[PDB]
Structure formats: structure tokens, C-alpha cells
Design a protein around this nucleic acid. Sequence first.
RNA 1: GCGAAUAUUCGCUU
RNA 2: GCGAAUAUUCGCUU
Lengths: 108, 108
Amino acid sequence: SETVLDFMFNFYHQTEEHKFQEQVSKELIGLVVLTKYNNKTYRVDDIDWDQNPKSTFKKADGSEVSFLEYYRKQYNQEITDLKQPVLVSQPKGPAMLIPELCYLTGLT
Amino acid sequence: SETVLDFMFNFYHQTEEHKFQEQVSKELIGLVVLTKYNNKTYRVDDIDWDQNPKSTFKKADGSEVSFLEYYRKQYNQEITDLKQPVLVSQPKGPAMLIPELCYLTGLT
RNA sequence: GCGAAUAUUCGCUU
RNA sequence: GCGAAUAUUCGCUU
């Protein structure tokens, strides 16, 4: 089962940086992704190109951790690619998902 | 630690298919790679663009398994990207290495 | 679904 | 280095 990161460099190939980001945004935004470390599905409704796996967030307990730290400590999932963007899913404080750690699904 | 697959789509970006394969070949052939499932290092001395993770090989016992099957059964390592090539390392019957499952090293 | 710990056996070039 | 099994506790939106 291919990951969202695998999809990004397999679905459409583009040498233009801005055209790559607009095409990837058009292809992914709306799809439901399944995380490989927790059996939860999320609807990806945005892609944060200003964040990467070294970016940090605030936990429910109020401590700050990087995405690298979070998934290593919580699920023992080692993120290898540091240049990838972070997907964002809005509920109801959005969930920031790593493309390398998410499977694809045909969805609305 | 970035993988060889991560390297392929981060080191040099090329829209031309043949130029991508020649540049990747030039950049990788000669480097020593470390597999993340077994603490062994291999010198990559060729890239087999005619093989992928669904390709099969003959085991020491003489049974035929795909690369997907091998690493799932032997090391519980799930290969997600099916379009990637297979690296080849010659000894002394070469070892066929999956880019997704290999870390990089500065080497001769 | 992915992990952690302790104990006891195990598998591993491709 | 990555795993497997059995048993006993555990952690998990980001």
C-alpha cells in the first residue's frame, strides 16, 4: 500500500516547483488518508508547504514536541524524509499528518 | 536518516526520464548503503531499472520469493513504493537492495 | 492499527 | 540491526 509521499512523486511529475505544489494540492485535497500507525482515517483538506517533519506542535498536556519526536516516542515510527510537507485535517486545532506515514484511499 | 528512495527525489530533480536515470546512476553508483533491517553495509555498484519490489529472486534453499514477500516474512519490513528500481551489489550472485530500505553513507 | 516494558525461546546475504 | 512466538502489564487525535 503506497504512502502519500510515494503518491507525490508518482502521480504527477513536474520540474516547475509552483506547478508541482498546485497539482499535488489539487490531487490530494479532498481525499481520505489512513495512517499506518493508528487505525484512524482523516480527510486531507489542506497541505502545509511551510511545515516539515522537524516542525513542532503543542500536545494536549501542553508540552512542545517535533513530529520526528512525536512518532518516534508514541508509535515508534521513524520519519526518514525531512523535506516533505505536512498535511492538515480540520475537525468538528487541526491534525497535522505526515505523508510518509499515511496510506491512500478513494474518497470524498 | 534519509533513505536511498528519499535521496532519488531530493538530490536532483529532472523531468526527462532518461536524464533522471543517468543522473541517479551517476550519483549513487559507488556509494555505500546501510540497510535499516540488518546492520550490514553494501557498496551499490549498479541500479537495475528493469526490476522493482514485485520482482522475484531465488533463495539459498532454492525457493522463489518476491522482494515484497522476502522483507515482510524475514524482517517484517513493508515496502510501500512499487515503482522504485532495485540496487545491485556484487560480492567476492549479487545482492538486490531496495532503495526504500537503505540508508545513505559517504563512501568510496 | 502502530508500538513500549519484563521474562523465555527463535529467524535473518539476496 | 530488523523482526517472530508465548505469557504478563502498559501507551496512543495532532
